[PDB]
Structures are given as structure tokens and as C-alpha cells.
Symmetry: C3
Subunit: 196 residues, 3 copies
């Protein structure tokens, strides 16, 4: 996981288990750093995006004071999709596809189910878990699974342009809103750890 | 009332012939179905082109026990709607994991027009379709045709009337095919906040009606 | 400020800390009035809609949402920050094609804890994140598609439509409506009270 400060308060993190814990530590390093004001998680051009390790990562991404942007160019499946659901703004290319196929794979979907209900409501979460169908970018956008869609070439610069706009806001204002607005969400993730 | 095994792990529950004995029987059936390990999916069906589905204090207790059981059982429940789903009828469907509507399906919450309270309706519509749709439904008492109900999240899917039960059983077959432990360790945990919400309404709904 | 009866139990209300207290008091007066069955908050044709500031802002938000009478917000222009937040406490937001919704607290340089909660309760987490982080304007049709507006009408029939609906709401048995509204709104009211404490608790 190669992080790289591009200035203007932006931190671009270009992409398991060790990769989990590395990302959990990098998010805390970025949260403690005064110079950083916005994080961007990029899967790469066309590329894809125990209990305690996964919960620590989900709760970290959602609990840090700084906002996180997930730039999705291809597929975002299960755990990968779940990480993006901990981010404040999911920007997808018109080619992006979202899948939560846990039931078909034969595993429980407690994290996926909770996280999807938060971003898209019970109906969409239920449609996704029970059918295991793929959500194309435009359906994902309409359902609240994506905040915005762009053409694949524009994806990374639109993400950095938004990170810049966010970085240009009074740090205190943003950083005192984000952990408080995400407290109910983080609490819900914590209950899932215990029940499993 | 009448339940039937379709033998893929599918139990089709049908509304025969809303009273308090009807609620208790449905509640007991839901509990019998959660107990039987040969059952992996439940399909609630109104019929062919038919509508879906001190003295007051006992009505509320049976209603609450029905809504809490339908939402708290470990088995997924599919509601198949071929006509009108009004008040209590619509409320039962809002406890199920998947609402499949025919293009003849019409959804209404006319409680206010009828002159009765809508504590449960208000809570359940908010959970399924969001606050705005809930408020539009309660205050206008307008009907929600199938296409509009789908857009707003009141239906998970729409189909043509001749394929309604076919699609219901095809989807029930898909759900039944998943590892039961995977589905059954998810359905009751994911629904716990919704079940807790329904439990708080019990005392509130009593005062209101 | 200016309140008016239109008959059929309809109360049309038209409109700093003192202005917040005046609206809170009016809402309580209308709740106690047996002749009032529906309230219409109107910004007017073509117009817009420290620890003690928190208290008066919470008292207003919780009063608009906790009263037994339904409140319709008629929006003919801009609804920014506090103005947007007031309408988010109302049960029915009716906008004209010239209604524009903005939550630009971050661009202005201030926290958006009330805005964040209220936007999430009304239109979901995603819409909330779009509005807070971009600080963009939501025109009438985009707000309708996102659940920020319940309905859109052409501005010539905006007040007409708000009254048409107020009459429909008023025509219902009052006890059915008035015993439902504070109950359905209690989780929303509880959330606002949590934020009042957490806002004071942080300063």
C-alpha cells in the first residue's frame, strides 16, 4: 500500500490480513498528521477496490476526523465494497460494478447488510444480499451506493479536485462534524463484532 | 392460515377465506416455520388477483407480536402482492425481506382518511422507503401504483401478473439454495434494530388508537 | 412572525435568536389552539425560507418536529443552512421550480452537526454527504429526486397547492393525526436533543 502526499492537504493511497492492518495503521498515521486534510483511496485504472482485524479497519476508516474519498474504477466486491462503504464519498466510473455475493459464496453478511442499509436503505440491501446481482454504476448512483459517477479517464482527477475542495475547508469545521456524524455508524459496526 | 411445502425448502403460506385470531395463527405459523429445519425460505401470498392479507389494547399486542415475529425469525420471508396492500395488509408486507409486486399491485396507508392512528405505518414506511415517502403516503392517503412503489423502495421488484407466483418461487428457490447457516445467522441480526423499533411502538400505538 | 387563519383550521405562518424564539412560541400557541389542524410555513412569493444559541436553535427544531399539528413548508426560493434545517423539521416540503436547497456550512467555515443529522434523517447518509462535502445547490427537480422535497409545482400555484394539501390534512379526524405525528417524530426529536448535549459537551 503506497501512500503519497500530493500537497494541498491530500493523501493518495493507491492499493489480505497484513494489507488490512497496514491500511488500519496508515489511516491513523494520516489522522495524526496536521498537514493532511483529506484522504483518497484509489483502486487503480480498471482494477478491483479475523473478526477483530476487519472491524478495526472498518471502525478506523469511519472514526477518523478527516474525510475519505473512495475512487472506484472497476469491481467493488464483499470486503472491498464494505471498505468503500466506510468512506464519506464514493466516486465511481461509468464502468464501476458493485456486488455483495456473501450468501452465494456461503458465508454470513452481517457487515455487508448493516453497511448497505446505512448507504442505500433496507430495500437495496435486501435486493443485493438475497439476489447477489451486480449493481452497475448508474443503478448504484440512483440507490445511493455511489455519491457521483464520472467517465473512467476523469476518475482520478475528479477525486483529487474534490479532495482539494474538501482540503480548502476550515479543518476544524470538517474534523469536528465527521466523527460525530459517523458515531451511530461506528457503534453499529462495534455491535457486529460482539454478535459474531 | 394454510401453509404448504413446495419441497425445495419452500413453504408457501396463503391467506384463506383482519381479526385477532388470524394474527395469532400467522404468528404461530411463523414460529413453526422458524423451528422446522427442512424450511429455508417462506413465501407469503395473497392469492390470484386478490388483496394482500381494552378491546384495542389486545388488538395492538397481537399486531406487535405478529410484526415482531415476521421480522425476528431466522428464515427470509417473501411477500407476493397481486392486488391492493392497505393498512395492516401493507404493514405485514413491510416486515418481509422481499416484496414482489404484480403491475396490478396498489399500496395505500389511508389510516388518516379512515380516522385512525398510524404509529406502525409511520415507523414501517420510514424503514422501507424513507421519511419523505412515508410522509407523502400518510398525509395524502394516495395510492402507490407498482412502478412508483418500486422507485420509492416499497417493492423490491415488479413483474407482470401472469408471472408473479413463478418469480416468487424462482426467487424462493435461489434463497433456499444458499447455505442455510449463512442466511439464518444474518437475517435476525440485520433485522434487530427494526424489531426493537416495533417493540417501542407497542405502548405508543395503544394510547393513539 | 405574521400568522393568519384561512378557515378550515388552517394556520398560515409567514417569515437571529429573537426571531427563533418568536417562531418557537408561535408553534406552541398553534399546538394549544383547538381550531388549528394544519400549519403552513411560507417564506413568501419569490423569497428565501454560544451555548444559548444552541439552546434556541434546538428549542425551535424540536418544537417544529414535536408539536401535534402537521407542518407544511412552502419553499419559493433559497433554503440555506438554518433555513433549510427548519424545513427539514416539517412533515411536507413543497417547493416551486425556483426552490434551491443548500447546506454550505463547510464553505462558510462552521461545523454542520445539526445539518448532518437532519439531512441524513430526511434523505439518507449519501445525499447528506453529497450536500455537506460539495456545498453545491440542489435545484427543485434534483431535490425531489433525492427526497429533500416532497413535491414540486410551478410557482403560480405554489401557495394554492400548499392550501389544497392543508385542507386535505385538516379534513382528517384530528385525534388520529395529532396522536400520530409526535410519536412518528420522537426518534428524530431524540436525535436533535442528543446533538444539543454533544454540541455543548464539545465546547
Amino acid at each position: 500500500i503506497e501512500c503519497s502526499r500530493l500537497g494541498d492537504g491530500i493523501a493518495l493511497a493507491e492499493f489480505s490480513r497484513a494489507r488490512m492492518r497496514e491500511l488500519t495503521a496508515l489511516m491513523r498515521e494520516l489522522d495524526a498528521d496536521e498537514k493532511v486534510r483529506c484522504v483518497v483511496l484509489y483502486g487503480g485504472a480498471g482494477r478491483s477496490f479475523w473478526i477483530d482485524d476487519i472491524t478495526d479497519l472498518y471502525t478506523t476508516v469511519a472514526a477518523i476526523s478527516k474525510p475519505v474519498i473512495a475512487a472506484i474504477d472497476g469491481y467493488a466486491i464483499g470486503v472491498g465494497l464494505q471498505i468503500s462503504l466506510c468512506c464519506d464519498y464514493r466516486l465511481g466510473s461509468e464502468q464501476a460494478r458493485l456486488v455483495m455475493p456473501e450468501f452465494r459464496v456461503g458465508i454470513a453478511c452481517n457487515f455487508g447488510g448493516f453497511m448497505l442499509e446505512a448507504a442505500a436503505g433496507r430495500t437495496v440491501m435486501q435486493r443485493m444480499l438475497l439476489t447477489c446481482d451486480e449493481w452497475p454504476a448508474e443503478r448504484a448512483l440512483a440507490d445511493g451506493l455511489l455519491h457521483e459517477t464520472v467517465a473512467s479517464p476523469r476518475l482520478l482527477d475528479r477525486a483529487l479536485e474534490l479532495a482539494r475542495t474538501i482540503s480548502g475547508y476550515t479543518a476544524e469545521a470538517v474534523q469536528s462534524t465527521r466523527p460525530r456524524v459517523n458515531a451511530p455508524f461506528v457503534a453499529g459496526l462495534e455491535r457486529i463484532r460482539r454478535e459474531a
